Amino acid sequence: SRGSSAGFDRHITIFSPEGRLYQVEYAFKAINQGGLTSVAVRGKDCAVIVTQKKVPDKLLDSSTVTHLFKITENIGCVMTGMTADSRSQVQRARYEAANWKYKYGYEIPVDMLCKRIADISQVYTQNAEMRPLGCCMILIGIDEEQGPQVYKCDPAGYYCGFKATAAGVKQTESTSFLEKKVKKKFDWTFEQTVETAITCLSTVLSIDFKPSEIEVGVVTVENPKFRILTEAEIDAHLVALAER
Amino acid sequence: GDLVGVNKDSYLILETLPTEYDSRVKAMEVDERPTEQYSDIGGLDKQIQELVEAIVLPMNHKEKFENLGIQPP
């Protein structure tokens, strides 16, 4: 035991003598390869995503580097990991969402559209023929009977429902900052939530942002469309958090 | 630390000696290897510049590093 090799077992996805899948414990290390971090916070009226946006050059256009993707009109999500795998899995989400509406006729819940992204990933675990995708989707969206919701699904399959999560480089550090602001408990208004998200990302990286260094995706119960906030709206919250 | 001769019976300090290095380091002699001339290295003309400017130049024109204000690599 204790990590031994069964010969092949770090080159395909079969059990080790220990009882683990080394090939999937590696695909998690890809998520941190990206170098970005994304926080997601649930309110009582709205769920917020905030992502670090890193434009390395002056050449790259800044409006086509985004990590926030519209899956439906009532489902956004943020992709962390290898950018190739990411876009490949977003494409696949959109497909399922619109296939759902086509077969059942009432657009898809955020619950199930994760459960299907999760199960496609699971197949890549169980066969030897391919590697698993090296990315990690966090969906948000308002449910018609449970308020807002946040789900995160991993390269192995395991997906769960959250009140606040992160993913990427500072995935440990964030969830220690967040769980303190969750056991206290507030009203969690729309301005409460955006406040908790930006201040978590801003302190765990130490940046203290410019409106052009984050992109903020948000979905309210009053207006269930998934918006991506422009730089004008983002700045209103940053100078409000510099006062307070 | 210093090395010193000592009279082999009555332990008197007789003189101070030049410090000593392991004979394998003196065997790593500063040899005298036959000229070969940078003209007889084919291609690799850039490489020669990159090395000379980093090793050879600070041996005579450290004046040009002091006037600019930097330390050689």
Partner: protein
């Protein structure tokens, strides 16, 4: 590696034979150092 950048910027000057550096000298040096820094082996975090 920032200590390197400031030296490299110096070396272009000594090569061109100026008595001063400029804003390109530090622009080039960051590109050079940054290429070999990435090439020259991956650095891993070792936690305690």
């Amino acid at each position: 590696d920032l200590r390197n950048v400031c030296t490299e910027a110096g070396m272009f000057a000594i090569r061109a034979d100026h008595d001063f550096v400029v804003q390109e000298d530090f622009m080039k040096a960051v590109r050079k150092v940054a290429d070999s820094k990435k090439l020259e082996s991956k650095l891993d975090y070792k936690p305690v």
